Enzyme design. Structure first.
Site, PDB file in Angstrom:
ATOM      1  N   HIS A   1      63.614  68.707  17.894  1.00 53.25           N
ATOM      2  CA  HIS A   1      63.476  69.763  16.898  1.00 53.25           C
ATOM      3  C   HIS A   1      63.618  71.138  17.544  1.00 53.25           C
ATOM      4  O   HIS A   1      63.394  71.322  18.739  1.00 53.25           O
ATOM      5  CB  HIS A   1      62.127  69.684  16.131  1.00 53.25           C
ATOM      6  N   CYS A   2      63.956  72.118  16.736  1.00 49.79           N
ATOM      7  CA  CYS A   2      64.053  73.455  17.243  1.00 49.79           C
ATOM      8  C   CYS A   2      63.349  74.370  16.261  1.00 49.79           C
ATOM      9  O   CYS A   2      62.222  74.096  15.853  1.00 49.79           O
ATOM     10  CB  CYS A   2      65.509  73.851  17.532  1.00 49.79           C
ATOM     11  N   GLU A   3      64.024  75.422  15.844  1.00 49.51           N
ATOM     12  CA  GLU A   3      63.451  76.406  14.948  1.00 49.51           C
ATOM     13  C   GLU A   3      63.217  75.862  13.523  1.00 49.51           C
ATOM     14  O   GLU A   3      62.081  75.792  13.020  1.00 49.51           O
ATOM     15  CB  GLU A   3      64.373  77.641  14.959  1.00 49.51           C
TER      16      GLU A   3
END
Length: 161
Positions: A95-97
């Protein structure tokens, strides 16, 4: 369908996402794993937080590892593999932002490199997921599963005038 090495199916339930070739999970599913729901079936659960170290430091999913650059991902996951596989599952969630672009990219990167260093269809990481909504959604819904229970996003330029 089945996981990367076609030996079994995906353990978690999945939600639709932008990249139809990848498996996405919701923050609710994510929270349940963390609640220990599949403790007996999982050998290792890796959560790969792709955000900038400064964001990550200000609040990340408990247990998550910050691997922002492809080179870090290379060194971390791909450099130290195998371990006691013992018939239990090795799962990695990315996951990121807002889990758009960097997250899906890193996910496909790990698979390609894994494929390369193996005889088809063996994989050291046959099961990968992207956390739908990234850390923003997860935080709002599952603040108690975050460490620290805070969210520290990066600044963006208001200049577009």
């Amino acid at each position: 369908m089945l996981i990367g090495d076609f030996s079994k199916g995906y353990l978690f339930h999945t939600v639709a996402g932008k990249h139809q070739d990848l498996k996405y999970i919701s923050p609710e599913i994510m929270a349940s794993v963390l609640n220990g729901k599949f403790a007996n079936l999982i050998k290792e659960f890796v959560i790969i937080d792709c955000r900038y170290p400064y964001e990550y430091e200000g609040g990340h999913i408990k247990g998550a590892v910050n691997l922002h650059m492809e080179e870090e991902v290379e060194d971390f996951l791909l450099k130290k593999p195998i371990v006691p596989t013992d018939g239990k599952r090795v799962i990695v969630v990315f996951h990121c932002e807002f889990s758009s672009e960097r997250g899906p990219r890193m996910c496909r990167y790990v698979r390609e490199r894994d494929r390369l260093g193996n005889e088809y269809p063996k994989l050291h990481y046959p099961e990968l997921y992207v956390l739908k909504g990234g850390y923003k959604e997860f935080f709002m819904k599952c603040q108690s599963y975050c460490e620290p229970p805070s969210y520290r996003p990066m600044h963006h330029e208001d200049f577009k005038e």
